């Protein structure tokens, strides 16, 4: 197991524009296209991302390309973030993937705000961090996914994905 497989399980794969859990236009493997309510805006953003006139449909290879770019950006956003970097550096390989997942889903800014949990993760207080991460809208809106992530942070293993 790795970050790619992990997120592919959490995000799924869809080749046609769709609405995510928040109602926003997305495509491929959880690639957010736009927060705007306009499907045209979504289609414009898609074409621009892909470099071709798509008509809201891409190929599996295209989805994967978007995916790699997106995983790369998440890691990079973590590395450049003063609140995130130190946490990520203090963690083991498994748990770093859990942090990347949260970043991919929530955004750098969103994750950077879990101050208290961040601090708990840094101290390696697993059970405590797990409890604190659960007190959040994130857990409340997407409980199954959050549970998977939180378990990964608590155990340092891939059990929740097997
Ligand atoms: Cl892009
Ligand atoms: Cl869920």
From Swiss-Prot:
Annotated TM spans: none
**Biological process terms in GO annotation:** cell wall macromolecule catabolic process; defense response to bacterium; peptidoglycan catabolic process; viral release from host cell by cytolysis
Ribonucleoprotein among keywords: no
Which sites bind substrate? 32, 104, 117, 132
Please tell me where this protein is predominantly located: host cell
The cross-references to Gene3D superfamilies, in alphabetical order and at most eight, read: 1.10.530.40
The annotated consequence of residue 117 to V reads:
50-fold decrease in enzymatic activity
Q: What does this protein do?
A: Endolysin with lysozyme activity that degrades host peptidoglycans and participates with the holin and spanin proteins in the sequential events which lead to the programmed host cell lysis releasing the mature viral particles. Once the holin has permeabilized the host cell membrane, the endolysin can reach the periplasm and break down the peptidoglycan layer.
Q: What is this protein called?
A: Endolysin
